Structures are given as structure tokens and as C-alpha cells.
Design a protein around this ligand. Structure first.
Ligand SMILES: OC[C@H]1O[C@@H](c2nc(-c3ccccc3)cs2)[C@H](O)[C@@H](O)[C@@H]1O
Ligand SMILES: OC[C@H]1O[C@@H](c2nc(-c3ccccc3)cs2)[C@H](O)[C@@H](O)[C@@H]1O
Ligand SMILES: *Cc1c(COP(=O)(O)O)cnc(C)c1O
Ligand SMILES: *Cc1c(COP(=O)(O)O)cnc(C)c1O
Lengths: 810, 810
């Protein structure tokens, strides 16, 4: 049909069709009279996977011959989403498969919708890992993702009576056709035990063994015939485990619990033992694999020339003491040499400054579970604090503040401190966030080791986030400037010369209108709900958090409702306000916010006077596959975190790429997005970081805003009095009470500037041609936000490897 | 190589080789430089499985068009063993695969040895289910095996310090290439809840849901292109199960425990709740499937014309009240009509008379777990006891003895009584066992319903138990009388005309000698142990039990040892005495017997005076794949159960087929084996059933035998004084004490006749030509013991269906 989906060669289509029917028969053991849509999806998945196999074997082969430096991306989260369409895009098979399926009387879009999301992540951090693997394969780096094959990913969100309910994400029920189990590469992981000191050094004995069994998933580069590996570990009991008989066999589940379930907290620390077991499990099995591959090329001087280990936040921080333990206790290197190797091998990406997200593990937990690692951590701290003392003699306060060990009723290990000490590079994830790291939480470490601190601004893969989810926009761009931009997103600047072209203005607005029609139809077919596709689609999708200020959006929505009621017969730009996101199951306030959003919908969507001028929709089960549908349908992106709270964000970039204008704070990557597009092409409002600091020094009094802003007072009085909860008058007292007395994120302080800026948005939407010219200015400057840029900067400035766009042979 | 392994067509071999290399590449994602023997086995398994797929789809198709009466074999056990060689035998692929593998530089025998046993059974009963599926497919019956896919089968047995240790049988670790998951046919199963009575009858409410997910394994007939289905259910939690969050997800393991592990008790009842859940789970999911298939042809009059359900012992007895519950509570049939349907549908095979094996479930358990089934069971009992009262007026004792409910401190349900009441046919498993059922434990039921009671003597599949395990013997037989005997084992009688042929005498003895060489080499390569292949191989393999009297064999072995020591320089026929079997993990005495066997080995195998004239070997981890090696290597079969304890046995038949002479009691199928071969061709000794009865009436005094038999007294004194346990003098006091004061199985009563009969065996072994002529007389009359005979009798006399040897089209 469209050109960026590749050729449908006659030979190619014939070949796909016979292999589809071979897999239906031999793989699925179905005839065509009993097959379901689900069987057809599996037959297609197996057929497309066959095109990966040759390239995967060849790539791993090439890396063995050439022996390049290897990159190990350690993450507890890989938010992959669906694999089938992404595989077709990257092998140029998409049109051939459409044609092949079409001639067997099937619709490929319908079969795509049957694939389960691999939801092995919470949000931004997990999805950054996924975008990174795609960019690493596209830039031909010998790169490996290492994590955990959770049996249950992020929970499925149902809404009942407007409340979040959680269901187990049983994503493996029907089987994963993309993974290959490698039980032959199974490795032991140790827990508990105690430390014996001998003549021959320290010895970790009386341990409990858990087996780590790897599953390999292919990661295809973009049309370069590179296929990298994502290796996820599964927990298996050894067969003598607990070995009356029956109970011993049943208790194997204790050990296999380690890989059972993803912790569903976004940007929050829960100090639970099962989580610490997850963190050690992925690190212990991974390091053993890294060292085995290295030894298959005595001498660890070359280890850092052949190995880079990137830590995705502190979650795999134990990689540092584990590498020491292997090099010191097992390889019998002296401490100083092993430490040199560790520091030149490891680099740490910090993703947050929120204090409740920083991993601070109680010592009693580490003492019981990893006794040797705690000894190594103490040894690291003593030697690190000896270097601080020498550089800053007499600064005892510095010593206490920089310690890896926090004093307190409970002693804790600050894993962030461990990561800075044990890494040659520490990066934040947007320029403003990396600056905040040097000015505030890591100021002491910066002053000791200024050379370690870098910025690597986040990005998104334009493969999944443009070609895959928005083929129509991809195509009109490819008509003007060719295909090459897909692996070189900076080429989108050429679109600035098309900003006064009537034809291109018409095409950009037509694609947006087609995406909205398609998404409005999708809402009706799966959730029986009537929306106006001529309305402005105002979209805030992201995890539910106080810092992300879904509540500020709520206040705007109630303001528009109250203005309509005051003056019913006045014209307003119609809006569909869509908010979506999961709350962590234990996060009471995040659950109340979801409930308030649906409570507002219940009132405004059934007010006859409102008409179709204002609709409030809660998008259920926001996940990667819903993001691929709603982000292309969006007109306004809501990026409204309190300045200095959102380290980067990446949703922001997805929307810029897809033809939505941004309303946002000078927070995270929003700052660089505005800088790339021009501030005049961005709906900037609210406090800067400096303004929030000034408010903090003085004291935030929310009462002051309630007394001065009648529009705001009316909303607070409505919430209190049960305007939005008639049956439970006081349902929202916790929300009012937080906004009035303990708002860490200063929602009222930004209210007035938010509403005025939202008026500036409505005014521009009234002029389609100028709205669309501003959209073109956004899409055309979005190139910086390619994860290809990000990964090339990691490779050159951290890992010491040259990216490459050269094809391997097919 | 040999003719009964089929043709190696040039096209055929080429085709196997390209498909082997396709699966190695696309299925296993290996090149030939990194593949292991295990990869090669998987590539072959997938290649051979591809030949099943067409036949499987076609067969299930044919059964839908023709709509024959369907047979449902309900068992908690299917002891399948390995599938690969059996699949090749039944599709005539064996020589083509040997040739194909040979030309790729691989040895097929080496790859076969890598397959794990599917050990989903304890012994005879589980293996009878497996032989039955093979015979049902060979006789073209529309037959289905229904059971449980246990994650862990019968434990792996290790010996440490001569003691049994148990290891988890993790048979699915590397994947099962033979099964196909059918998660689309997933069915709910209910537990707990309570019964509400309404206008519209009884209602089972507030239940806990567990999902039953079916896995299908193909069952190929012998060269008839029929492939039947074995469907095993797996337990899965529903996704709202327990649905703080983490613990809810972890607690899904409670529900999935149901299909986790096979109970490892052979011919013993353990009244545990998890076992009752296993029994209901397989019955509830199976009946729903049976009824769905039936409705896809209102009216249940025809149900028994379209459905036979065979109960494999009482383990699925709940099929009876479950079928009532479905027909009465859900289909709203009146009680009398539903009962007619149930009785004409169900038939019950009894496998034992040992009182400790009979399932007697406490009422409090059934009350809590299956409240409605208990109400239906009470209703069955009341109506059944009303028919007893009418036929035997005033016989109140009969009423108490025949009740389905046993009175006692704990009330119990006698599941055997439930099965007789609810079945149109009740069979035992050998003529003597079926006679004992009518004379003793079911005498009352026989007098009420004489027409229900049948014999169906057990059999073994000559495919696995001759062609597969003993190709050499298969071939010399096929040279004289052709191939046709393999599906018509009665044709073995033609071998009686070859009993004076020198050539055939030489060939029978040559095959036996080759099997012994091959098995002696196997002992050295896997367990570093030196045995004389010129010695008589005296073999007792079967589960470790008091009733099977491994201890009587021990007493003989110690007798031979003491005779050698008394007269060292006298000639004795050399023997390798091999005993093998697992003990139930909780069966203290069975574990002591294993320990005594190894204790005897420790003494006799290191006595210089003994030389290689007597070796005692404990065969570790006796299982189906070890039976395929040792049974063809055997000279003497030990079948020495106390008369009236072994219902049938089936090991006995395996050895008769494979050229071993039998030493045994007139117990079980031994009686019919002797009758077929002639008593003069059988080493018959010991009490008959009548003799044991006479001893019981009088009282068994073991002291009398100890006082009268000096040879026996010496052995008891050796055991007591620590001759066999120098470091623990009193290790065996429990064994001595049992033999002297509480021997239920009268080991001393048979001692003297056993030793004399063993002397008659040694004397015949001295004359190879007459030993071999007696072997030919055994093999040639073994036809009756084909499971093809057994299944044809079930089909004609119980199920009301005509077997068939007609090929389906390929
Ligand atoms: O860099 C990728 C994204 O990382 C997000 C972060 N996630 C976590 C996080 C902690 C624990 C468990 C899951 C997740 C901390 S910061 C940050 O909140 C986002 O601003 C940023 O865009
Ligand atoms: O008919 C097949 C065989 O059945 C054996 C039997 N197994 C059981 C048995 C009970 C519970 C769990 C497993 C097994 C009872 S009788 C009998 O003990 C054998 O004699 C007989 O040959
Ligand atoms: C990109 C993405 C995120 C991160 O969005 P932010 O707005 O940066 O928090 C979260 N969830 C999903 C499903 C995503 O695709
Ligand atoms: C046949 C068989 C049995 C049953 O043997 P008996 O001697 O009848 O108890 C037990 N185990 C295995 C592995 C078998 O193959």
C-alpha cells in the first residue's frame, strides 16, 4: 500500500504464504476449518520469526570472530510491548506480510491486536531500556540486554465504580513465540550463607542455590540485518532442593518466586527482601555470563577494553560489589587492581532526584542475604572516605554526607553513593536534571570527581514511535524528503522548508484527522463511548503521580466546566480531555486521583448544557500498545510536572514526533524540546526551578492562592461539599486536605498561569492553518530526541565504541 | 539394518535429513558448530513429530465425520516412558531415521538415551494405562486418555550409603516436544462453596475456581495411520485470583499446586486433601470436555450409545457423582433417568484387594471440598441400600457391609462401593483376582448384581515390549514367521514348530547373550561395576513392597552365600542377582529392604572366596527406560508375591515375551502364564491361595519355621548379630522383628519350597539347549498377554464397540 512499509515481491509473498500454512499445520496442529484469529496470529508470528533466525545466528557468529567490545545494559525493566509489527518494520517485511495475509483472506491489523504486550516495565525507565536495545541494534553495537523474565508483568488495570482494580498480567498463558529457552546456559546464584576467612582469603559458604535459566529474545536493527540479544533470567529450584516428600516438591515455589512478578512502583522505593533478591539474581547470573564470554576470546587488565556494563538506575548496583567479589574471592586479584577493573567497566545512569525513589537498603537485610557483599561494601566505603578525607581535610560533615553507610535508627546503604564510587561515568537523563545532580544531591561527589559527571538526554526510537504507530505521517514525510530520516532523525529539519507549502499543511492535518477518526472508532468498538472527533484531543498519559500533577489538569477541566455553566450560550473550542495511567497498587493518593478523574467525567459527560463541548475520558490500562494508538491521535501533549521533579520524561518526545503541540513546565527534556522548536512554538507556563526554590525558602502557603483566586476557591468548595460525589459527600477530603496543607508539588502555585496558557491553546486551535504550521515546526525539530542520538553519545563518551550504519550480509 | 525396522527409501532419507537441518536452524536456533547431543535429539524429535501431525489431524477429523462411540480412559497415571523410538516404530520410520542420522555423522541410539522418561506413574497401573492407549490406537478405537500433566513425575532414586534418596523428576526442564498446549480449551473446575436449595433444585455457589488447561500428546497406532489423543490437564489460577498485590500474585501457586506432583505411593492409600483435589480436577475438566464433544454431534438417552467412561481403579470414582451433578443440577434431568445414563456410561476396573490400598475418604474432607458431591453420594447410598433391603429382607448386616458410608470414629466413603453401584461393569485384572473379588471383598455385590462382574486379564504392548526393546529377538522371529505377529501376538504359537530346530535354538540363545553383553557394558559405562555375562541373570524389578517379597529373594541370596562359604571348592551355577525398584518415600520398611539388599551386596561382592560366582546388584532408579534394557537381558524372572496379593502383575508378561524363565507363585497372571506355557515350563513353588487361607485359620507362627530350618535360623542370627551391618549391629532389628512376629506375607512359609525350586533353576541352566527349548515354549505361548487381546475384550464385552485392523489413508 504505502512505500516505507517495503516491497511486496511476487516470490516473497508466495514464500510467506506457504510458510504461514506450514506453521498452521506443523507448528499449531490446526486445519483452516478449526483455526481462530489467535492461531492465525501465531502462524504469522512464527513465519516472521523464521526471517530473524539466519540474521541472529550470523550476528552472534560475527561478534565471536571480530571480538568487538561488548555493551551490557543491566535493567530490572524492559517495557518491550508487542514484537510482531516491529519485527516486520525492521526486516522490511510489512507490505509483503500484508499482501500474503490479504490473499489468505485475513486482515493483518486484526491479527496484530491479538499479540500481548510484553509489559516487563512500569513506564519511562523500562521503555527507555526497550528504545535503547532497538537503537543499539540499529547502530550495530555488540550490545546485550540483561534482565528478568517475570512470569507476571505490570498488572492489567480495570476500572470498577471509577476505581482502579488490578489483575495479574498472565502474558505467557498462550506462549511467547519470540523467546528461545536456553536451559543449557543455566547458572547458579547464591543467597544467605556466611563468610569464612582462611589463609586463601574470604569464602562464601552454606549458601542457598537458586538456578538462573536464560531466555533469549531477538532485537533486530533497522534494515541492517543486525539481530542483538535480550537475555532474561528465570528462577528454577535445584532438584535436591528441600530434598516430607510432597511438601519439599511444593516448596520449590519459594525459590521460583524470585522471577514471578514485576514490582509495580514507578519512581518509588519499596525496601522488600523479594525485590533485593530480584536485584542480586539478575546481577549474579549476568556477571557469570559476561565473564564466561570474556574468557572465551588469566588477565583482567583487558576486561574493561572488552566489557562495558551500564547500570539502569541503582536497581543493579550490586553488579559493583559482585564484580569485586568474583575478581577478589574467586580470581584472587588484589583489591586495588580489581577495583580499577570494576570502575573502568561500570557506568551509572541516575533517573531521579525524588528522595522516596532513592534505593537505601537496610544493613540487617544485606547482612542476612548477602553477607560477603556487605563486607565488600564496607571496604569500598572506608577506602572512598579515605580519599575524601585527603582531598578535604577536616570536612567531617562531608565524610558523613558522602558515606555509602547512612547512620540512623536503621543503618542503610545508599546504593546511589555506591554507584558513583564504583563507576567511571555518572549521567543524568536531561540537561536540567544532570545540572541539578551537580548543584544539589551529588554536589559533594561532583567536587571530588568532576570528570565522572555527564549528560545523556533521553530519546525514543522513531521506528516504533513514528513508522510503526503512525505510518501515514511517516509516508507524507517520506514523499517529500525520502526514507533515510528513519535512521537519521536530524533529517526532519528539511521539513522546515515545507512550512508554507499548502499541500504539506493539508497532508499533516489530514493524517492527524485520520488518526483521530481511527482512535475515536477504537474507543466505541472496545469501550462503548461517544466522542467528537472535531474536538481538540487534550491527552495526559503517564503513570499516576502527585509530581506529574494529573490534579492540575483536573483543576483546569473543572474550570472549563464552571465557565460553560456560568455562560452556557458562549462559544468555547470543544475538547476531549483524555487522562490515562496506572497507579501503584499501594499508592492511596494516586488511586484517589483516578477516582476523582472518573467522578468529574460522571458529572461533565452527562450535563445536557455541556453538549459535546467538553468530554472527560479515563483511558483504562494505559500500556505501550495503547500509547501507539492515542499518541498519534493527540493534538495537545500535557507535560505539567512541577519544575525539577520529572528527570526527563519520554512521552513528551513521543507526542512532539507525532504532531501534537506541548503544554508544559520548564521541566526535564521539555526545556531542550522548547529550545529545539523555539519557545514561540511551545506552550510554556509556570514556575521555573529557581521560582520553586524561592517559594520553598519563603514557605508554600496554598491558602494564599485559595484566598486570591475565586475560580480556584469555587473548585475546592465543590470538591469538599460533594458536588462530584453526591452519595459520599466527603469522598475527596484527603485530596482537598493535601492541596491545602501538604502539597509537595505546589499545584495551586501553577494554577493561574496554566489556565491562561490553556486559553492561548484554544485560541490557536481556532486557526487550523497556524496550528498545523506550529505542528510542522515541532515535528521538524524533533530529531535530537531520537534514541539513536542518545546511544551514539553513550557509545562515544562512556563506552568507548564507534557506532556504525553499515549492513551485515543477509 | 534389520527388516522389522522398515525401509530406508533414498527419497525418505534425503527428506528426513533436510527437515533435521531445518529444525536445527529454525526451531533450535543453533548452527552445527555449537549444537550438543541434546540439540540433535530435539532436532530428530521435531522431525519425527512432523510425520505424526497429518495423521493426527486426519484421525480427529474422521472421528468427527463418522461420529463413532468414544472411549474415555480416566487414570491419575500414564507411565509413558520415552516417545521418540515408539513413534518411529509405529510409523515404520526407524531404519530411515537411523540411515538419515548415520549420514549426518550421528548415532541415533546415543540421541534416544537423551530423552527423559515421561514418568507420570508409579508402576503397573500407570504402565497398563500406557499399554492400553497404544492398543486402543492399534485397534482403531476412537479412544482418549484423560489425566493430569504433573510438573513432577515419580521421583528420581539415588542410592547414598546404600539408602534411597529422592530427587524431583524435573522432566519438563528442557521442554516436551510431544505435547501441544491447548489453552483455548481451558475449563473451570470448582472447589469448596456450599449448596443452596431453591425452587429450580440444588445450586453449588461461593466456589473457588481453578482453571484446567489441556495439553494434547499424540498416540500413534501400529502402522495403521491412526493417531489418538492423550489429554492431560494443568492447573492455572484465574487472573482475578486473590485480586497486598505481590502476595496475591505469589499465592496463585496455592491453586497451581493441584497439578504440581504425582503422589509416589504404589498400591497404598494416603487420605490427603491435595490428592482428593487431583482426583476431582481430572474428573471435572474431563466430564465437561466429554459432554461438549457429545453435544457437538437436549437428549441424554443416546449419551451411553456415544460415550464409554472407563475408571482406572477408584482414583476417578468422582466421575460418577459428577456426571449425576451435571445431568441433575445443570441439565435438569430427573434423578432416575440421570442414574440410568451414568450406570450405562461408567465401568470400573478394580486393581487390588490389599485393604491399605482401598480409597476410603473421610466425610469431613468431602463435606468441606465437594459439599454437593457428598449429598449426591448419600442419595446414591440410600437408593442402593433400598434395593439391597428389597432383595435381602431382614439382612441388616448386609446393609452395613454394602453401605457406601462406613460408620466409625471417622465416617468414610468407600469409593469401591460407589464404583460398583454406579457402573454397569466391574472387572478384575487376572482370572484368580476376579474370582477373589466374587468370593471375598465384593461377594455381597456379586450376589445382588452377578451380571456386572467380569475378568479382563492384563496385557503389555508387544510394540514397546518386544520390537522396541528387543529388536534382535523380533527379527529372528520375523525371519521364520513374518511381521504380522506384532499386531496379532497369538501368531507366536507358530514358534512351537521350531522348538527342535538347531538354527532357531542357536539364534534365541545368541540374542539373549547379545542383550546380556550390551546390558553388562551399560552397567560399567553408567555405574562402574564388573559383572560376569556368562552368569545366570536373576532379576526382580518392581516397586519395593512387603507383599512382593524382595525379602524372600534376599533370604535365597544369603542362603547361596552361606552354602558357598560352607563348601567353597564345590561347583555352583554362577548368578548375577539384580534387584531394582523404588520405595514410597514414607514407606519405612520398603526403605530398610533397599538398605538390606545393598548391605548384602557390600558383603558378598567383596568376598574373595565367592569370586564372580555370586554378585548382588541393586539397580538404581528402576523406571520404564531401565525396564527396556534389563528385561531383554534377563534369564530368570522373579514373581514371588504371596498368593492372593498381586492382582495381576505385568512385569511377569514382559519377561515371558523376552526369553526369561519365570520362578513364581500361583499368584495373579502367573496362573494363566503357566496354563498357557504348561506347568512343566514354569518354576512354580509355594502356597496356593487355599494354603494361605488354611495357615490364617490356624495362625501363622514364623517361630515354627525358624526352629525347623537350620539354614533359615543361621540367616536370622546373621541379620540380628550385625554380620551385614558391622558398624550398626542392630540396623536390621525392625526387619527381623517383622519376619518373626508380624509378617502379613508369610515369607518363611514359602522359604523352603523357594530354595529347592531355585536349585531346579540352576540345574536346567547347566544344560543350555534344554534351557533355550523351555524359553521357546514360553515366548511361543505369550500371545494371550498382548494388551491387544485385553483391549479387544474390553471393547466387545464392556464398551460395545468393534475393534478394527484396517489402515486409515496416509
Ligand atoms: O529516564 C527514564 C525515566 O525514568 C523515570 C524513573 N523511573 C524510576 C523508577 C524507579 C523504580 C522503579 C521503576 C522506575 C525512577 S526515575 C523518570 O521519572 C523519568 O523522568 C525518566 O524519563
Ligand atoms: O492392573 C495393573 C496393576 O495394578 C497394580 C495396582 N496399583 C495400585 C495403585 C494404587 C494407588 C496408586 C498407584 C497404584 C493399586 S493396584 C497391582 O498391584 C498389580 O498387580 C497390577 O498388575
Ligand atoms: C513512554 C511511556 C511512558 C513514559 O511517559 P512519561 O510521560 O515520560 O512518564 C510511560 N508509559 C508508557 C506505556 C510509555 O510508552
Ligand atoms: C511393567 C512395569 C511395572 C510393573 O511391574 P510388576 O512386576 O507387575 O509390579 C513397574 N514398573 C515399571 C517401570 C514397569 O515397566
Amino acid at each position: 500500500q504505502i512505500s516505507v512499509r517495503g516491497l511486496a515481491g511476487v516470490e516473497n509473498v508466495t514464500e510467506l504464504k506457504k510458510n504461514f500454512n506450514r506453521h498452521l499445520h506443523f507448528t499449531l496442529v490446526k486445519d483452516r476449518n478449526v483455526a481462530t484469529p489467535r492461531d492465525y496470529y501465531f502462524a504469522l508470528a512464527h513465519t516472521v520469526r523464521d526471517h530473524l533466525v539466519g540474521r541472529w545466528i550470523r550476528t552472534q557468529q560475527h561478534y565471536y570472530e571480530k571480538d568487538p567490545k561488548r555493551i551490557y545494559y543491566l535493567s530490572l525493566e524492559f517495557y518491550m510491548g508487542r514484537t510482531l509489527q516491529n519485527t516486520m518494520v525492521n526486516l522490511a517485511l510489512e507490505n509483503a506480510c500484508d499482501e500474503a495475509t490479504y490473499q489468505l483472506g485475513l486482515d493483518m491489523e486484526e491479527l496484530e491486536e491479538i499479540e500481548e504486550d510484553a509489559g516487563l516495565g512500569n513506564g519511562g525507565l523500562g521503555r527507555l531500556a526497550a528504545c535503547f536495545l532497538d537503537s543499539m541494534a540499529t547502530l550495530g553495537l555488540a550490545a546485550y540486554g540483561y534482565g528478568i523474565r517475570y512470569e507476571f508483568g505490570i498488572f492489567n488495570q480495570k476500572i470498577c465504580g471509577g476505581w482502579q482494580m488490578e489483575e495479574a498480567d498472565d502474558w505467557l498463558r498462550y506462549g511467547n513465540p519470540w523467546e528461545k529457552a536456553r536451559p543449557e546456559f543455566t547458572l547458579p546464584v547464591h543467597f544467605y550463607g556466611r563468610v569464612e576467612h582462611t589463609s586463601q582469603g574470604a569464602k562464601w559458604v552454606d549458601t542457598q542455590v537458586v538456578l538462573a535459566m536464560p531466555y533469549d529474545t531477538p532485537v533486530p536493527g533497522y534494515r541492517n540485518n543486525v539481530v542483538n540479544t535480550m537475555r532474561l533470567w528465570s528462577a528454577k529450584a535445584p532438584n535436591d532442593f528441600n530434598l516430607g516428600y510432597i511438601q519439599a516438591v511444593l516448596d520449590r515455589n519459594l525459590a521460583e518466586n524470585i522471577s514471578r512478578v514485576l514490582y509495580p512502583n514507578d519512581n518509588f522505593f519499596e525496601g522488600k527482601e523479594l525485590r533485593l533478591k530480584q536485584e542480586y539474581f539478575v546481577v549474579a547470573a549476568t556477571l557469570q555470563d559476561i565473564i564466561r564470554r570474556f574468557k572465551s576470546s588469566t588477565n583482567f587488565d583487558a576486561f574493561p577494553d572488552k566489557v562495558a556494563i551500564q547500570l539502569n538506575d541503582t536497581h543493579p548496583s550490586l553488579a559493583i560489589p559482585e564484580l569485586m567479589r568474583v575478581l577478589v574471592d574467586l580470581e584472587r586479584l588484589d583489591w586495588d587492581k580489581a577495583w580499577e577493573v570494576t570502575v573502568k567497566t561500570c557506568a551509572y545512569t541516575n533517573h531521579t532526584v525524588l528522595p522516596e525513589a532513592l534505593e537505601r537498603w537496610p544493613v540487617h537485610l544485606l547482612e542476612t542475604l548477602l553477607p560477603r557483599h556487605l563486607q565488600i561494601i564496607y571496604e569500598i566505603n572506608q577506602r572512598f572516605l579515605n580519599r575524601v578525607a585527603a582531598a578535604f581535610p577536616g570536612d567531617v560533615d562531608r565524610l558523613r554526607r558522602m558515606s555509602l553507610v547512612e547512620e540512623g535508627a536503621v543503618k542503610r546503604i545508599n546504593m546511589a553513593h555506591l554507584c558513583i564510587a564504583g563507576s567511571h561515568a555518572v549521567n543524568g537523563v536531561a540537561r536540567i536534571h544532570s545540572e541539578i545532580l551537580k548543584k544539589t544531591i551529588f554536589k559533594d561527589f561532583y567536587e571530588l570527581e568532576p570528570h565522572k559527571f555527564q549528560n545523556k538526554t533521553n530519546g525514543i526510537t522513531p521506528r516504533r514511535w513514528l513508522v510503526l504507530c503512525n505510518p501515514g505521517l511517516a509516508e507524507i514525510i517520506a514523499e517529500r524528503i525520502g526514507e533515510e530520516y528513519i535512521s537519521d532523525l536530524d533529517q526532519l529539519r528539511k521539513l522546515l522548508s515545507y512550512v508554507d507549502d499548502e499541500a504539506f499543511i493539508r497532508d499533516v492535518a489530514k493524517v492527524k484527522q485520520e488518526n483521530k477518526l481511527k482512535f475515536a472508532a477504537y474507543l466505541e468498538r472496545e469501550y462503548k463511548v461517544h466522542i467528537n472527533p472535531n474536538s481538540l484531543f487534550d491527552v495526559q498519559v503517564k503513570r499516576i503521580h502527585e509530581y506529574k500533577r494529573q490534579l492540575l489538569n483536573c483543576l483546569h477541566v473543572i474550570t472549563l466546566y464552571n465557565r460553560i455553566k456560568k455562560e452556557p450560550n458562549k462559544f468555547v473550542v470543544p475538547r476531549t480531555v483524555m487522562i490515562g495511567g496506572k497507579a501503584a497498587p499501594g499508592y492511596h493518593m494516586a488511586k484517589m486521583i483516578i477516582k476523582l478523574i472518573t467522578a468529574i467525567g460522571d458529572v461533565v459527560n452527562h450535563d445536557p448544557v455541556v453538549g459535546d463541548r467538553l468530554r472527560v475520558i479515563f483511558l483504562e490500562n494505559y500500556r505501550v500498545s495503547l500509547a501507539e494508538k492515542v499518541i498519534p491521535a493527540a493534538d495537545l501533549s500535557e507535560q505539567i510536572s512541577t519544575a525539577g521533579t520529572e528527570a526527563s520524561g519520554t512521552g513528551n518526545m513521543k507526542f512532539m514526533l507525532n504532531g501534537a503541540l506541548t503544554i508544559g513546565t520548564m521541566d526535564g527534556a521539555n526545556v531542550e524540546m522548547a529550545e529545539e522548536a523555539g519557545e514561540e512554538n511551545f506552550f510554556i507556563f509556570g514556575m521555573r526551578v529557581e521560582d520553586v526554590d524561592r517559594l520553598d525558602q519563603r514557605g508554600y502557603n496554598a491558602q494564599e492562592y485559595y484566598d486570591r483566586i475565586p475560580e480556584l476557591r469555587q473548585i475546592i468548595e465543590q470538591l469538599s461539599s460533594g458536588f462530584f460525589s453526591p452519595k459520599q459527600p466527603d469522598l475527596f477530603k484527603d485530596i482537598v486536605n493535601m492541596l491545602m496543607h501538604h502539597d509537595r508539588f505546589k499545584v495551586f502555585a501553577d494554577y493561574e498561569e496554566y489556565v491562561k496558557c490553556q486559553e492561548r491553546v484554544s485560541a490557536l486551535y481556532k486557526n487550523p492553518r497556524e496550528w498545523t504550521r506550529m505542528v510542522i515546526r515541532n515535528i521538524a525539530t524533533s530529531g535530537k530526541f531520537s534514541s539513536d542520538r542518545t546511544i551514539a553519545q553513550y557509545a562515544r563518551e562512556i563506552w568507548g565504541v564507534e557506532p556504525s550504519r553499515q549492513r551485515l550480509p543477509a
